[PDB]
Amino acid sequence: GVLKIVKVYLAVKRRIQPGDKMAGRHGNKGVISKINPIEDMPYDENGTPV
Amino acid sequence: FLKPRLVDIEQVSSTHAKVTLEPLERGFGHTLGNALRRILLSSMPGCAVTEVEIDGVLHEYSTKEGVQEDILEILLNLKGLAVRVQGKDEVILTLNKSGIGPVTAADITHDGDVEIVKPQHVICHLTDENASISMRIKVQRGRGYVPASTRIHSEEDERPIGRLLVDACYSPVERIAYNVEAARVEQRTDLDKLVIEMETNGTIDPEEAIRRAATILAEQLEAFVDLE
Amino acid sequence: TEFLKPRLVDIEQVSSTHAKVTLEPLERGFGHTLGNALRRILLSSMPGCAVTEVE
């Protein structure tokens, strides 16, 4: 007793935002808190921002 | 008191250049270093690929004949395409290519306003010898970083579903590192000399970049200062 | 093209000689720029007379 089924596959592309969870392989969990611009990162004397 | 003045620009290899800036007093070396580093690194005018329209593609989660790439790795290869525009603010380039082999940015069509800074930046490989790829790229001058989720408010009636919105990273710079060392001056003992090493993708010449950056900074300060 | 600059708003003198100045329309990251720049120029390099000789 069902006539017809229409299935629709969405493909969402989710990037990253504060609130996601990230983790190294050693069990250091963490929630991303603020997503800073490149201008505010600590950088060494060669100039590469962490 | 004593104001600076720019001196020799040294393009080191191809695309990254050291800009010296000799006559600076105490403290203004690190000051203008941090300030120009930030304003060059954050907000410089540049252009990147915004909309891509491949011929036989409904949407970016698909596959094409003869292309060994997927569609979204073609789009991520177009995101890194470094291009410059002379007398426009948006301009539509196109690709038409057939036959086995790599497809680079050198095979994008000819236009006098548009200059390609890397002819070897590989977009996509073709295999089947009959599968001709043909797309229309839309590059656009911009500022900062605008993802595809922010632009779709008015949506420009996206009913031509063959349009693929690419995240546009408009920033032409990649790394700005400054040194502050002392410049040996005739009578005055210590005057600091600034060296702003700057890595760009190749689209922006350095003197124009630093002139735009100092222009933006002085325009920010002239909110409560005035003309001099 | 979105180069929108701020404008000075109410300089709140608290009691005698020290003031809080806010500045509302600034783009992303220019706040720390103007703060560090004005801060280091005020705190390091001002024309100012101090106590030289006392006889």
Swiss-Prot record, chain A:
Co-administration of salinamide and rifampicin or salinamide and myxopyronin suppresses the emergence of resistance to both antibiotics. Acetylated on several lysine residues in the presence of glucose. It comes from the Bacteria. Disulfide bonds: none annotated. The RNAP catalytic core consists of 2 alpha, 1 beta, 1 beta' and 1 omega subunit. When a sigma factor is associated with the core the holoenzyme is formed, which can initiate transcription. The rRNA transcription and antitermination complex (rrnTAC) consists of RNAP, NusA, NusB, NusE (rpsJ), NusG, SubB, ribosomal protein S4, DNA and precursor rRNA; S4 is more flexible than other subunits. In pull-down experiments interacts with CedA. (Microbial infection) Interacts (via flap domain) with Escherichia phage lambda antitermination protein Q; this interaction renders bacterial RNAP resistant to transcription pausing and allows it to read through termination signals. Belongs to the RNA polymerase beta chain family. DNA-dependent RNA polymerase (RNAP) catalyzes the transcription of DNA into RNA using the four ribonucleoside triphosphates as substrates. This is DNA-directed RNA polymerase subunit beta. It comes from Escherichia coli (strain K12).
UniProtKB/Swiss-Prot annotation, chain B:
Disulfide bonds: none annotated. Residues 155-158 are annotated as: Required for interaction with Crp at class II promoters. Keywords: Acetylation, ADP-ribosylation, DNA-directed RNA polymerase, Nucleotidyltransferase, Transcription, Transferase. GO terms for cellular component: cytoplasm; cytosol; cytosolic DNA-directed RNA polymerase complex; membrane; transcription elongation factor complex. It catalyses: RNA(n) + a ribonucleoside 5'-triphosphate = RNA(n+1) + diphosphate. (Microbial infection) ADP-ribosylated on both alpha subunits by the phage T4 protein ModA. ADP-ribosylated on only one of the alpha subunits by the phage T4 protein Alt. GO terms for molecular function: DNA binding; DNA-directed RNA polymerase activity; protein dimerization activity. It comes from the Bacteria. Transmembrane segments: none annotated. The keyword DNA-binding does not apply. GO terms for biological process: bacterial-type flagellum assembly; bacterial-type flagellum-dependent cell motility; cell motility; cellular response to cell envelope stress; DNA-templated transcription initiation; intracellular iron ion homeostasis; nitrate assimilation; regulation of DNA-templated transcription elongation. Residues 1-227 are annotated as: Alpha N-terminal domain (alpha-NTD). Its EC number is 2.7.7.6. The keyword tRNA processing does not apply. The N-terminal domain is essential for RNAP assembly and basal transcription, whereas the C-terminal domain is involved in interaction with transcriptional regulators (such as CRP) and with upstream promoter elements. DNA-dependent RNA polymerase (RNAP) catalyzes the transcription of DNA into RNA using the four ribonucleoside triphosphates as substrates. This subunit plays an important role in subunit assembly since its dimerization is the first step in the sequential assembly of subunits to form the holoenzyme. Belongs to the RNA polymerase alpha chain family. This is DNA-directed RNA polymerase subunit alpha. It comes from Escherichia coli (strain K12). The gene is rpoA.
UniProtKB/Swiss-Prot annotation, chain C:
(Microbial infection) ADP-ribosylated on both alpha subunits by the phage T4 protein ModA. ADP-ribosylated on only one of the alpha subunits by the phage T4 protein Alt. It comes from the Bacteria. The N-terminal domain is essential for RNAP assembly and basal transcription, whereas the C-terminal domain is involved in interaction with transcriptional regulators (such as CRP) and with upstream promoter elements. DNA-dependent RNA polymerase (RNAP) catalyzes the transcription of DNA into RNA using the four ribonucleoside triphosphates as substrates. This subunit plays an important role in subunit assembly since its dimerization is the first step in the sequential assembly of subunits to form the holoenzyme. Belongs to the RNA polymerase alpha chain family. Homodimer. The RNAP catalytic core consists of 2 alpha, 1 beta, 1 beta' and 1 omega subunit. When a sigma factor is associated with the core the holoenzyme is formed, which can initiate transcription. Both the N- and C-terminus interact with different regions of transcriptional regulator CRP. The rRNA transcription and antitermination complex (rrnTAC) consists of RNAP, NusA, NusB, NusE (rpsJ), NusG, SubB, ribosomal protein S4, DNA and precursor rRNA; S4 is more flexible than other subunits. This is DNA-directed RNA polymerase subunit alpha. It comes from Escherichia coli (strain K12).
